[PDB]
Design a protein around this nucleic acid. Structure first.
Lengths: 141, 185, 55, 124
RNA sequence: CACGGGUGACGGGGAAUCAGGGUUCGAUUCCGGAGAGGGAGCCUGAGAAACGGCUACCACAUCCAAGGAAGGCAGCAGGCGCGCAAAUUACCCACUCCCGACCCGGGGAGGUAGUGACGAAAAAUAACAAUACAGGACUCUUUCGAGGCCCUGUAAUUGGAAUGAGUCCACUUUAAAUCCUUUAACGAGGAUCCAUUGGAGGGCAAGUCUGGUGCCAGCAGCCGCGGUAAUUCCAGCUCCAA
């Protein structure tokens, strides 16, 4: 602190209050716009409806094709290009099936080779995709 | 509204670093030599020592002849000697800081069973407690983490209902003797 | 395109999992781990080989 | 080989009984029933077992000792004056109602529908 | 810093987390406030603007013979919707007290159970001995090798010793139960009565092992790997962390 007066507590508190708004983490957590733009709305997981499967081209040097799914929510109606987590799992997903979509772990930032996707699929048709890969569960058909 | 506790409390604290080579060497020494089961109870004795160390440190900050220091200092040293960890001629609050985690582990009943020599192995010592073959002051203890007091140390022996002691034979002895007599007729 | 999903996993050759003795568990797992790390070693010069290191 | 000793023994003139904690030692065998307790306390205190109400048995870990608590009444009519009804049914001398609590609630509001003498006609 | 606006604001005692200071939370058992779908008004009563009390309007909903009548589970259960998200339309006044004209009646308050990997505490999934061995402190031997006074470990090698989980009775427990404990009998040598979850280039412990794949599939929180010798993809062996 610069001012060191014996009764400058309201000056020091106002400076710390104002300079907190210049912090990226404080302004994100204390503004309605950050929560408005979030499709989850503070939710850890959400259910959505598959309307199409979208292939996403990769970034600089590492080049491949990433398998994604355009997920449309039920609680908000917004559309999310969610990423299919593991290898060979797009054969598991079908059209017009409800999916449990969460984040991937970077908390609102595009992850690695995939451009513009922050979301991954956990459960499909109330059946876990991890057990589908392991063969522990079979899709009801 | 219900009348109950609602008091959940952890007895251990995980280390801040999970994957360092130095800590993995030290706790693995403590498990095999004293017959422990996992790293959780390794941290569980460290968490108890942290309470005693922190309670002693705030007493050193207090001035001498402080009646809070006089009463809490003597009450803390009463418990330390009576479990056989601190010497009675070493009864002073400033040697609590010099107490290590190596000293607590003998007063565990699993290690005291080996220290009294009635078990073949330190891991066999845990089996004898599990199978209720021993007793302390005419009371069977089924748990290896029993804290043996200084005055209760000499009363550890086999239980009355124990085939290893003066009791009825076990299931295997009844199984082997019955078919040995059944084969002969 | 989206046609090559499960391309490699489908064409990987299948090895059925072979049978082995079940590992000793409980505190016996840590008892087994303690002896072969500390008391079973001998003083040897050179680099100490890892538990899985094969060349 | 089962010896019973006296703990927390005191007489009651306010309540017309005795009361004490019953300490039972039966090593190497099962927990003896509350019925078995009654005549053992009856013989050593030289009284009848029908005024002996002993309950609350919990076995210690390892066996050989159970802790129980019981009351000794001065007479049988005292034993029925100040006593819960379930303990009288524990010895079979009292038979309580067997009508479920929910059913007792079923005809209560049905008697509220009819004002007058015909409340008793609603029930059964 | 008045006024005003927002509050994803019932407030506090307190909770997590910290060397020291702080940050975040507090719908939630105790206290105090507000309400019974949204307002408004009132009768009785000492005490209500009461809604497990009425009177109207609004919104929803019910039976109807079409004339009319009747409702408020943010009380315990339970059903639908909403969701990522949350249990039984169970038993009992036996404990706590409360109410009544009352020792006696009543209490979905409350207590007891059922579901229940919220979570916390304790704690199984084995132990010993013998044979071959790989060897460790000693004496001889300049090495080789020996006995094991003392041992350490390995091997579906062998051998009996002890219990639980479960089957299971007696008693206890309780209002009646149930669980736990005691008690008999069974109940384990691959004690098949078989522990899973992640990872193995770095952070970060742990294969430059084997095969397939060939910038494809994919892996990867980040750096980065893959384009025919992949220590990073998919499988197997092995190993590492709880």
């Amino acid at each position: 602190g610069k001012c060191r007066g014996l009764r400058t507590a309201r000056k020091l508190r106002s400076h710390r209050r104002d300079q907190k708004w210049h912090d990226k983490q404080y302004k994100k957590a204390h503004l309605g716009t950050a929560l408005k733009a979030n499709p989850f709305g503070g939710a850890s997981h959400a259910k959505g409806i598959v309307l199409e499967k979208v292939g996403v081209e990769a970034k600089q040097p590492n080049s491949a094709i990433r398998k994604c799914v355009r997920v449309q929510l039920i609680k908000n109606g917004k559309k999310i290009t969610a990423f299919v987590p593991n290898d060979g799992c797009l054969n598991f997903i079908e059209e017009n099936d409800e999916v449990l979509v969460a984040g991937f772990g970077r908390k609102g930032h595009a992850v690695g080779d995939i451009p513009g996707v922050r979301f991954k699929v956990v459960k499909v048709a109330n059946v876990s995709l991890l057990a589908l890969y392991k063969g522990k569960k079979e899709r009801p058909r | 509204p219900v009348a109950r506790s609602w008091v959940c409390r952890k007895t251990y604290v995980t280390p801040r670093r999970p994957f360092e080579k130095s800590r993995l060497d030290q706790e693995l020494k403590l498990i095999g030599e004293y017959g422990l089961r996992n790293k959780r109870e390794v941290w569980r004795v460290k968490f108890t020592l942290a309470k005693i160390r922190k309670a002693a440190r705030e007493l050193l900050t207090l001035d001498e002849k402080d009646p809070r220091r006089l009463f809490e200092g003597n009450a803390l040293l009463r418990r330390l000697v009576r479990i056989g960890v601190l010497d009675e001629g070493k009864m002073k609050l400033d040697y609590i800081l010099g107490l290590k985690i190596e000293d607590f582990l003998e007063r565990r009943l699993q290690t005291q069973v080996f220290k009294l020599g009635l078990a073949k192995s330190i891991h066999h010592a845990r089996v004898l407690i599990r199978q209720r073959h021993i007793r302390v002051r005419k009371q069977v203890v089924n748990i290896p983490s029993f804290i043996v007091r200084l005055d209760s140390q000499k009363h550890i022996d086999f239980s009355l209902r124990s085939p290893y002691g003066g009791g009825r034979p076990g299931r295997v002895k009844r199984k082997n003797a019955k078919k040995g007599q059944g084969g002969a007729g | 395109s989206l046609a090559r999903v499960g391309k490699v996993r489908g064409q990987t050759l299948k090895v059925a999992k072979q049978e082995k003795k079940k590992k000793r568990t409980g505190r016996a797992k840590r008892r087994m781990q303690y002896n072969r790390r500390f008391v079973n070693v001998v003083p040897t010069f050179g680099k100490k080989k890892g538990p899985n290191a094969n060349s | 080989t089962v010896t019973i000793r006296t703990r927390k023994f005191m007489t009651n003139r306010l309540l017309q009984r005795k009361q004490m904690v019953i300490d039972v030692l039966h090593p190497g065998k099962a927990t003896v029933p509350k019925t078995e307790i009654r005549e053992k306390l009856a013989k050593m205190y030289k009284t009848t077992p029908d005024v002996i109400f002993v309950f609350g048995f919990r076995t210690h870990f390892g066996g050989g000792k159970t802790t129980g608590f019981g009351m000794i009444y001065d007479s049988l009519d005292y034993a029925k004056k100040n006593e819960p009804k379930h303990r009288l049914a524990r010895h079979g001398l009292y038979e309580k109602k067997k009508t479920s609590r929910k059913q007792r609630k079923e005809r209560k509001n049905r008697m509220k529908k009819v004002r007058g003498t015909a409340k008793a006609n609603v029930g059964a």
